[PDB]
Amino acid sequence: GSSGSSGSQPDHGRLSPPEAPDRPTISTASETSVYVTWIPRGNGGFPIQSFRVEYKKLKKVGDWILATSAIPPSRLSVEITGLEKGISYKFRVRALNMLGESEPSAPSRPYVVSGSGPSSG
């Protein structure tokens, strides 16, 4: 553990980078993409510049990959396209500011992209 200061206080000069945002959700957006919605908490003191969404293949071996990027601070939800059907994987969110990038948000639940969800009729 080697715990450190871990103390929250109103900085004045020496600021810090953004922290890992809440856990992103998974919704049915398409057969090749999915609607992801996250909730940012800390920005390190400065205004978030852009976010980062990454995923990981469970059925297939391979570290986390990069889905999208260059997302605005006002956009807390986007459609992650470019996925492979029949391949289970998770998603995450990262905050990048003029100070640096944030930690890897908790790995949301595993979503198995099968198709365009249900139908109307």
Swiss-Prot record:
Task of the protein: Component of a cell-surface receptor complex that mediates cell-cell interactions between muscle precursor cells. Promotes differentiation of myogenic cells.
Subunit structure: Part of a complex that contains BOC, CDON, NEO1, cadherins and CTNNB1. Interacts with SHH, DHH and IHH. Interacts with NTN3. Interacts with CDH2 and CTNNB1. Interacts with CDH15 only during the early stages of myoblast differentiation.
Fibronectin type-III domain ranges (all copies): 20-115
Stretches assigned to coiled coil: none
Expressing tissues: Highly expressed in embryonic somites, limb buds, dermomyotomes and in the neural tube.
Name of the protein in its database record: Brother of CDO
Subcellular location: Membrane
Superkingdom of origin organism: Eukaryota
Induction notes from the record: Up-regulated during early stages of myoblast differentiation.
